[PDB]
Design a protein around this nucleic acid. Structure first.
Lengths: 71, 176, 38, 141, 94, 164
RNA sequence: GUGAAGAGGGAAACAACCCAGACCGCCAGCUAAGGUCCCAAAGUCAUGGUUAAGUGGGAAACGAUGUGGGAAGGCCCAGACAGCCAGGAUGUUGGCUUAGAAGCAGCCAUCAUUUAAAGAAAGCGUAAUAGCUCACUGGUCGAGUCGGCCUGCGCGGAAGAU
RNA sequence: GAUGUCGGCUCAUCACAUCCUGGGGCUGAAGUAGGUCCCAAGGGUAUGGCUGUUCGCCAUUUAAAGUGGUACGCGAGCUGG
């Protein structure tokens, strides 16, 4: 699992292992895991902007009184 | 499968502490002796270790023999201690311990900084003779294994650090 | 090691053992037998 | 492995184990000092004819002290003398360089009797048959 | 040597034989003498792993069906085009 | 079933000779070592002793199908069994012939005419006076009991009454 | 047959494929092929078997002590299987070859002998002799194991202009 | 009712089946060196001549003188042999 991209430069694919992506900047494994689950352009941007992950275990969301949900 | 059927019957005075799947073997004359059984479920009884299938795996007897082997090796490590005297052939190489550190030369311009895991201790009578002491059968060979990283018994003239069983065997040119 | 395909028994101690999805010939007579893949 | 074997093999002429080449390398390789063996073999060789190579089978302890059985000359030396042959054919069965009767064979077999383990003087004879066969003597009834 | 069983054929035709082979059963007949051929169904892997010994064919067979026993020896074998598996075997009274 | 008869036959074969033996002797080696065994077969044909080397699986199944005397505790661990139905002293002599290039503590026990003979005692049976020397010790024993003991006691009560 | 002379459903969709043959309208309902975690309409479906490869969900030659089940069968506590240890002998360091030439440098013999027992040797090995594992024998050893065959599942072979 | 060419220059780009350093197995490899040999697309990757020349030959550099594709890349960039 190496998260394939070609943003625009240099011969080759460029890559990053799932482990680098969870150990450093940990948001992104789960971020580009839900990305492909939402439709096309406009509706898929509109569904996405409601979510936040931050880095992990550093949340600021005490004051709203969050409703717990188990998966 | 016959060595998965061995009831072990652990010795008197070895402390085998069971958290269900995690087992910690303690006693005198070594440190840091443990197993995480993850493929197989291990019940202790009072001392008769019994091996069977774990949730989310399908292979059988295959790690149950390993559990037997690995738990009993550990038990045997704390009781008598498995042989401790290790040694190397080839002039000018060495493995002289000075404290927690193993001093050797490889012609390198840096200090090699080869050092012991926390799960072993060592001392040396002579610069080519090393005695590693502990009660985990895996660790004593894991530091040997790193010592061997660039000093394997060579396949021609055989020089290297020599210990226990090793799967390079040495070979000859065709017979004279 | 040479990469190859299909593993055969070169000497009476070629055990032949499956490490990952590739079968290694590992022998304990001669170091000469290490075919990496099967 | 102790690296111990009973009945390690040697063949050296009864007056020539004073030099090392007639003993060859093997003895040295299992660590029996050649002079010490030479003195001990000389004490037991006087009823044996000199220069006839005697097989001697040694059993060895840990500390490399050694014990030795000395034997009457090979069935192959005796068979060469009795057939009027210097040497064997160098091919078994196909090549003939002579012939042997049973009565010359039963006496070769008694000359080995105290070394031969067999329970019958016929079994002992039977054992030396394939030694005549190898050297191009036909064993005739 | 072998003591086996058989059933008499419920269904005949091509359409009928193929639903037995879907179920890992196969057919037979015992011919010879003055008397009729007894058409029968067998179980496939009952005789496949017997016929691993050469004794299924070298020695006669006890085949009991509706309590009738006549004694029999194997005859010529029909096998599937590209599998050794038995499509049909013939038998003669012995 | 077995592929061969050798393992099942030998159980019957060992019980047969070993009830019958007037002496047999059960001794230890786990690899009897060839120089000595062949030297014990060489001599064995002089003396008329027979020797089999035999597994504790066979010896246990033998005790189970057939009753044995005074050897069936010495079958435990690695075992040779040498046995004689004739000249019982010679069976025991064979162990002093094996003791010469090898160890004498290896006997666990023996039986001799239904008697248990313990490991230490059998070195004495193997000493084996000849018939003239046997008659002569039977006389020393009777001349001892006759006149030697007689004076031995009367001196020992005379010393004791004499007071200091 | 379908398109040509056809809507609508599914397929990453096309001209032809699988369903099917658009009268128009109805915030009606069912069923088809094709679907049923999100994308996206419905099953993270229940029951039993099985696998470590994202195999599944990309193809052949070919091969192997990768992995499981099965019935029929040999071995199968009278002790397997074969690991671990220990013996591995008597003529014999057989003949030739050689300083020695020893099962294993090369070649021919390829056996016989006391044996409860050890091939004049399968494989290794100072290049060779020496030592070594190996059945078989005797300690440990007290249960599965192997050939045939049916069968679920795996493997590498399968490296490219973006 | 048209994607318009070779050789060369300019400017590049992507596949690794890597020209090379680098890590490492085998070797009938003593060590060195080579043969054998797996990983790897990151970076650097020479120049004058003759011919219309792809291809050729020669002189020379470089530790070294690579492999493949782009309307036979690239005239809504350059030539008219």
């Amino acid at each position: 699992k190496v998260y394939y991209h070609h943003t625009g430069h240099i011969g080759g694919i460029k890559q990053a292992t799932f482990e680098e992506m969870i150990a450093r900047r940990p948001e992104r494994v789960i971020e580009i895991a839900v990305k492909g689950m939402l439709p096309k352009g406009p509706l898929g941007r509109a569904m996405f902007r409601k979510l936040k992950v931050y880095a992990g275990n550093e949340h600021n969301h005490a004051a709203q009184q969050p409703q717990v949900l188990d998966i | 499968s016959r060595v998965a059927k061995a009831p072990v019957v652990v010795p008197a005075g070895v402390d085998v502490k069971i958290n269900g799947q995690v087992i910690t073997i303690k006693g005198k004359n070594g440190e840091l002796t443990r197993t995480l059984n993850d493929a197989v479920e291990v019940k202790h009884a009072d001392n008769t270790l019994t091996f069977g299938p774990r949730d989310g795996y399908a292979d059988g007897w295959a790690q149950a023999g390993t559990a037997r082997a690995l738990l009993n090796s550990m038990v045997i490590g704390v009781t008598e201690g498995f042989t401790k005297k290790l040694q190397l052939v080839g002039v000018g190489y060495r493995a002289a311990v000075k404290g927690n550190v193993i001093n050797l030369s490889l012609g390198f311009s840096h200090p090699v900084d080869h050092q012991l895991p926390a799960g072993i201790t060592a001392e040396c009578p002579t610069q080519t003779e090393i005695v590693l002491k502990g009660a985990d059968k895996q660790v004593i060979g894991q530091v040997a294994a790193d010592l061997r990283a660039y000093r394997r018994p060579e396949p021609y003239k055989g020089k290297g650090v020599r210990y226990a069983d090793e799967v390079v065997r040495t070979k000859e040119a065709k017979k004279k | 090691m040479k990469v190859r395909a299909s593993v055969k028994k070169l000497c009476r101690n070629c055990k032949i053992v499956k490490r990952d999805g590739v079968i290694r010939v590992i022998c304990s007579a001669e170091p000469k037998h290490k075919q990496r893949q099967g | 492995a102790k690296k111990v074997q009973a009945y390690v093999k040697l063949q050296v002429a009864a007056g020539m184990a004073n030099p090392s080449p007639p003993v060859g390398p093997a003895l040295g390789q299992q660590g029996v000092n050649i002079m010490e063996f030479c003195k001990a073999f000389n004490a037991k060789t006087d009823s044996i004819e000199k220069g006839l190579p005697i097989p001697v089978v040694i059993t060895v302890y840990a500390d490399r002290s050694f014990t030795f059985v000395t034997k009457t000359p090979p069935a192959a030396v005796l068979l060469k003398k009795a057939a009027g042959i210097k040497s064997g054919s160098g091919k078994p069965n196909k090549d003939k360089v002579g012939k042997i009767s049973r009565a010359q064979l039963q006496e070769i077999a008694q000359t080995k009797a105290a070394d031969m383990t067999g329970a019958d003087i016929e079994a002992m004879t039977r054992s030396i048959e394939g030694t005549a066969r190898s050297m191009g003597l036909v064993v005739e009834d | 040597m072998f003591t086996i069983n058989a059933e008499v054929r419920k269904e005949q035709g091509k359409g009928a034989s193929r639903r037995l082979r879907a179920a890992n059963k196969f057919p037979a007949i015992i011919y010879g003498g003055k008397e009729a051929p007894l058409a029968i169904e067998l179980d496939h892997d009952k005789v496949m792993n017997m016929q691993a010994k050469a004794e299924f064919y070298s020695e006669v067979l006890t085949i009991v069906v509706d309590g009738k026993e006549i004694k029999v020896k194997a005859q010529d074998v029909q096998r599937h085009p590209y599998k050794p598996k038995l499509q049909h075997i013939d038998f003669v009274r012995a | 079933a077995l592929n061969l008869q050798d393992k099942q036959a030998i159980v019957a074969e060992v019980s047969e000779v070993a009830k019958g033996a007037l002496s047999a002797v059960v001794a230890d080696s786990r690899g009897v070592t060839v120089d000595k065994m062949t030297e014990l077969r060489k001599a064995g044909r002089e003396a008329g002793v027979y020797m089999r080397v035999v597994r504790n699986t066979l010896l246990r199944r033998a005790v189970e199908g057939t009753p044995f005397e005074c050897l069936k505790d010495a079958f435990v661990g690695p075992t040779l069994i040498a046995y004689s139905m004739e000249h019982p002293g010679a069976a025991a002599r064979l162990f002093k012939e094996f003791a010469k290039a090898n160890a004498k503590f290896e006997v666990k026990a023996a039986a001799f005419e239904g008697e248990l003979i313990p490991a230490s005692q059998i070195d004495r049976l193997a000493t084996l006076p000849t018939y003239e020397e046997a008659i002569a010790r039977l006389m020393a024993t009777m001349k001892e009991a006759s006149a030697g003991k007689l004076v031995r006691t009367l001196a020992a009560v005379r010393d004791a009454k004499e007071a200091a």
